[PDB]
Scaffold this active site. Structure first.
Site, PDB file in Angstrom:
ATOM      1  N   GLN A 103       6.380 -16.631  -9.719  1.00  0.00           N
ATOM      2  CA  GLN A 103       6.091 -17.248 -11.696  1.00  0.00           C
ATOM      3  C   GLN A 103       7.498 -18.213 -11.853  1.00  0.00           C
ATOM      4  O   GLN A 103       6.505 -19.481 -11.822  1.00  0.00           O
ATOM      5  CB  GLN A 103       5.742 -16.139 -12.161  1.00  0.00           C
ATOM      6  CG  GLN A 103       3.937 -15.531 -11.716  1.00  0.00           C
ATOM      7  CD  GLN A 103       3.224 -17.243 -12.308  1.00  0.00           C
ATOM      8  OE1 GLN A 103       2.755 -18.151 -12.963  1.00  0.00           O
ATOM      9  NE2 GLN A 103       1.723 -16.896 -11.286  1.00  0.00           N
TER      10      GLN A 103
ATOM     11  N   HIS B  49       2.127 -11.625 -19.232  1.00  0.00           N
ATOM     12  CA  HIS B  49       1.698 -10.408 -18.392  1.00  0.00           C
ATOM     13  C   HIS B  49       1.540  -9.292 -19.989  1.00  0.00           C
ATOM     14  O   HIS B  49       2.981  -8.624 -20.138  1.00  0.00           O
ATOM     15  CB  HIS B  49       1.890  -9.755 -17.114  1.00  0.00           C
ATOM     16  CG  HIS B  49       0.753  -8.569 -16.399  1.00  0.00           C
ATOM     17  ND1 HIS B  49      -0.431  -8.586 -16.890  1.00  0.00           N
ATOM     18  CD2 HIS B  49       1.102  -6.869 -16.097  1.00  0.00           C
ATOM     19  CE1 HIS B  49      -1.102  -7.286 -16.206  1.00  0.00           C
ATOM     20  NE2 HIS B  49      -0.499  -6.926 -15.928  1.00  0.00           N
TER      21      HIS B  49
ATOM     22  N   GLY C 145       2.192 -18.985  -7.569  1.00  0.00           N
ATOM     23  CA  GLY C 145       2.964 -19.770  -7.927  1.00  0.00           C
ATOM     24  C   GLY C 145       2.933 -20.796  -7.585  1.00  0.00           C
ATOM     25  O   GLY C 145       2.444 -21.987  -7.868  1.00  0.00           O
TER      26      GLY C 145
ATOM     27  N   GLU D 112      -6.821  -6.596  -9.522  1.00  0.00           N
ATOM     28  CA  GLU D 112      -6.173  -6.496  -8.482  1.00  0.00           C
ATOM     29  C   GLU D 112      -6.518  -4.757  -7.945  1.00  0.00           C
ATOM     30  O   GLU D 112      -5.977  -4.803  -6.497  1.00  0.00           O
ATOM     31  CB  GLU D 112      -4.397  -6.386  -9.116  1.00  0.00           C
ATOM     32  CG  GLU D 112      -4.218  -7.665  -9.517  1.00  0.00           C
ATOM     33  CD  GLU D 112      -3.030  -7.811 -10.502  1.00  0.00           C
ATOM     34  OE1 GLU D 112      -2.513  -6.569 -10.876  1.00  0.00           O
ATOM     35  OE2 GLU D 112      -2.342  -9.132 -10.862  1.00  0.00           O
TER      36      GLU D 112
ATOM     37  N   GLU E  53     -15.215 -15.296  11.422  1.00  0.00           N
ATOM     38  CA  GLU E  53     -16.438 -16.038  10.885  1.00  0.00           C
ATOM     39  C   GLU E  53     -16.348 -14.815   9.624  1.00  0.00           C
ATOM     40  O   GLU E  53     -16.887 -15.672   8.578  1.00  0.00           O
ATOM     41  CB  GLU E  53     -17.482 -14.919  11.510  1.00  0.00           C
ATOM     42  CG  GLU E  53     -18.046 -15.563  12.489  1.00  0.00           C
ATOM     43  CD  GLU E  53     -18.183 -17.354  12.319  1.00  0.00           C
ATOM     44  OE1 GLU E  53     -19.052 -17.521  11.577  1.00  0.00           O
ATOM     45  OE2 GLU E  53     -17.092 -17.375  12.780  1.00  0.00           O
TER      46      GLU E  53
END
Ligand SMILES: NC(=O)c1ccc[n+]([C@@H]2O[C@H](COP(=O)([O-])OP(=O)(O)OC[C@H]3O[C@@H](n4cnc5c(N)ncnc54)[C@H](O)[C@@H]3O)[C@@H](O)[C@H]2O)c1
Ligand SMILES: NC(=O)c1ccc[n+]([C@@H]2O[C@H](COP(=O)([O-])OP(=O)(O)OC[C@H]3O[C@@H](n4cnc5c(N)ncnc54)[C@H](O)[C@@H]3O)[C@@H](O)[C@H]2O)c1
Ligand SMILES: O=C(O)C1(C(=O)O)CC1
Ligand SMILES: O=C(O)C1(C(=O)O)CC1
Ligand SMILES: [Mg+2]
Ligand SMILES: [Mg+2]
Ligand SMILES: [Mg+2]
Ligand SMILES: [Mg+2]
Lengths: 343, 340
Positions: free
Chosen positions: B28, B107, B133, B194, B225
């Site tokens: 970030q 956050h 980022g 997450e 695939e």
């Protein structure tokens, strides 16, 4: 062990003075037609009287009915829905396919079912891209390509292989890699991705959304996080390049990585692996093939209802709300399939 | 209703004559620093003595220790790992944060746990990008942006809102949309993506691969695939634009659409949504916070082992084999973060 062709393993020499008939101008047909033309290959489009016929004319192609396209072609690419192969092959292709001509399918299904068959004096092949039309076209224009699998089914001429790989090079597949794979295995692989993986991925994204919304989370935020932001999409596409667990290692905060590895390999009950096996059984055993022919017999009427029903699901209602409120970054697609230079 | 800011709802006027201290130069930090500089904002980097300090110097930034950067800044962006917020806040930030200065986190975790707190005479906010980022930097350079959520936690100045949104505009988030959302909700939402979704998606891709291989399918073809070809990735990214079911409707062969619609909504047993609830309970109830703090001990030694173990799983062994044999479409990233 695997046989994989890149640019160094193919040339355009076998297409010198040859005409390719692109049968269909849909998702695959339009991409093949555009890439072949820009690569300096003589193209004509064979198409029934529908919107695709007019689009092909609008984008500067020589367009006729299918029979006439086949009659004036050294190479024919059958790029129409697999259930239409049988009737078009029998009526339009087989009677008009020249001596020493090559017929190509982009999916093994019609070969497995015997709807497309080897003809004496002619070549039959599968050249099956592992990607849909828009990316095949964008990658090509960037000097890149999508992967493909190929199978030489019949080779009367003894020049089938080089002509198939020449088509593959002209469309840009050899910039990624073109691997030898049997038409039967390609069929089952392809249907598995479409029937187990894609539905399960969207079901997973939907489960995420539904749980968050029910737990009082802002519906717009819930939608963005599960896919709407493009973050999960970027993870999966960047994952294709460097690996999925590798994307997390490189781009994830320590908090994210610690969270990811806590639940990695622990999220799915055994029933998901069991379902994957069940889906393969339906694909391999003939159950799906019968289901498909029932759905196609009505001009895909059931499919039209399902498509309209899907847009009413909360996930897609929330999507429309998010897309109206947040601007998503997209490339202009206007002139994408109009004439360009060989990259 | 929802409060969403775009370019017409923010300006760079609040950043006139103001210096922004970017604390950290990681995923970030580097993107914030690059985008702020190219937007004509005065930027300083505060960083500990590691590779990121040297990178910031290499990419032409004014780089110092964290304490010095904060002392010479009107706005401080705390872009370091969340478990490090507490110590850096107490030792480096709070003692050095000027009167009427703004502190931003990306956050809400450190705010929920009370490791970052409101300070008298000073502003505290969350500006949380919904993207990592490299895409934030690529988007910015293309005149585009990623979405963000923001929360004005403390506003002593009364000017926190326009300063936070000016940063958001400078970094490019207002080109997509910047939505008001509580730091507490953002925390739980972010960890859910997450901890449930990302693992579950990769677990599913892996299940597809392992079943195909077990059934005697070509491992390279199986890997391609399930994600290796980029097709599943392109579906998900195109789906963000027009909708997932709509991608299938537009880009799918009739055979594909019939197959898709046969199993759509029928693949996952009730146990999956029940595990999702369990993951959220762990996130909301403090169980994960406790786990994260344990994992942070000895500079994330456990995570290092997990990362090395992951590369040796059949899926990632097959990936290396595929990526060696098949060229993937990539864009040059050299000097991506150098001045524009
Ligand atoms: N969708 C993909 O991206 C993709 C990927 C790889 C393989 N394939 C294969 O490529 C082939 C074409 O698929 P698609 O996705 O381009 O399909 P599509 O739905 O886009 O096909 C539309 C085209 O088919 C023609 N068509 C439709 N019904 C017809 C009929 N009854 N008779 C004659 N022409 C008819 C239309 O006129 C138009 O030119 C199939 O064999 C498919 O399995 C598709
Ligand atoms: N990863 C993302 O894309 C992303 C997305 C949105 C939010 N965030 C948030 O951004 C913040 C930074 O995350 P990141 O992904 O950039 O992390 P990162 O792993 O890239 O952080 C590395 C940076 O943190 C510094 N750092 C590491 N440990 C430190 C310590 N103990 N003391 C001081 N500095 C230390 C390093 O010097 C370097 O500048 C976090 O709060 C995270 O939740 C990250
Ligand atoms: O968006 C986030 O929160 C990420 C993180 O590492 O924290 C990138 C995934
Ligand atoms: O529609 C099809 O058939 C796809 C394929 O790759 O086979 C695009 C999904
Ligand atoms: Mg396919
Ligand atoms: Mg298919
Ligand atoms: Mg996060
Ligand atoms: Mg996030």
């Amino acid at each position: 062990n695997d046989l994989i062709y890149q640019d160094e393993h193919a040339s355009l020499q076998p297409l010198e003075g040859r005409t390719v008939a692109v049968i269909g101008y849909g998702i695959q047909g339009r991409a093949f037609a555009a890439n072949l033309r820009d690569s300096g290959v003589a193209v004509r489009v064979g198409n029934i009287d529908d919107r695709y016929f007019e689009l092909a004319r609008a984008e500067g192609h020589r367009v006729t009915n299918i029979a006439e396209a086949v009659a004036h072609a050294d190479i024919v690419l059958l790029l129409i829905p697999d259930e239409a192969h049988g009737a078009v092959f029998d009526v339009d292709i087989a009677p008009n396919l020249r001596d020493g001509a090559l017929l190509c399918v982009a999916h093994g299904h019609s070969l497995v079912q015997g709807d497309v068959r080897p003809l004496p004096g002619r070549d039959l092949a599968m050249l099956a891209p592992r990607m849909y039309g828009d990316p095949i076209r964008r990658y090509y224009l960037a000097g890149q390509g999508a992967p493909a699998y190929f199978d030489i089914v019949a080779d009367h001429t003894g020049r089938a292989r080089d002509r198939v790989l020449a088509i593959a090079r002209a469309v840009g597949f050899t910039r990624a890699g073109v691997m030898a794979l049997g038409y039967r295995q390609e069929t089952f692989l392809d249907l598995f991705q479409e029937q187990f993986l894609a539905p399960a991925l969207v079901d997973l994204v939907e489960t995420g959304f539904q749980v968050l919304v029910e737990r009082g989370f802002n519906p717009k935020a819930a939608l963005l996080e599960v896919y709407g932001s493009g973050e999960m999409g970027k993870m999966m596409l960047d994952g294709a390049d460097i690996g999925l667990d590798e994307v997390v290692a490189l781009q994830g905060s320590p908090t994210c990585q610690v969270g990811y590895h806590r639940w990695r390999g622990r999220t799915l009950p055994t029933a998901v692996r069991e379902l994957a096996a069940r889906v393969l059984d339906q694909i391999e055993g003939g159950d799906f093939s019968a289901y498909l022919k029932e759905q196609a017999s009505n001009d895909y009427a059931s499919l039209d209802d399902a498509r309209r029903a899907a847009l009413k699901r909360p996930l897609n209602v929330a999507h429309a709300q998010v897309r109206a409120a947040f601007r998503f970054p997209t490339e202009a697609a206007g002139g994408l399939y109009q004439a360009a230079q060989a990259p």
